[PDB]
Amino acid sequence: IALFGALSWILYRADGQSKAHEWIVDLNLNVLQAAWLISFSSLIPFRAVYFAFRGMAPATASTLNGLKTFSSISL
C-alpha cells in the first residue's frame, strides 16, 4: 500500500506538473531536487550520523549502570 500509494502520488504529481504553465520548469525542478538526494547519499557519513543520534538520547549515550554483582552475590 505504501509503495503503490507513493508511485500513485508521484504519477499524479508529475501529471499535474506537466499540465502546469511553466511545466518544463517544474520537471527540471524535480531533477534539481533528485540531484541533492543523490548527493546526500554520497556525502553524509551515515555511521557518524547514527552514533551522533545515539548520543542525543541519554539511554544510549551511556552504558546502563545499575545493579552491581557484589551487592547481589548469593551465598
Residue in this structure with the C-alpha cell 553524509, named with its chain if needed = 44
Smallest distance, Å, CB 23 to another protein? Answer: 7
Residues in 21-60 at the binding interface with another protein, rule: CB under 8 A: 21-25, 27-39, 41-43, 46-48, 50-51, 53-54, 56-60
Residues that bind another protein (CB under 8 A): 2, 9-10, 13-15, 17-25, 27-39, 41-43, 46-48, 50-51, 53-54, 56-60, 62-75
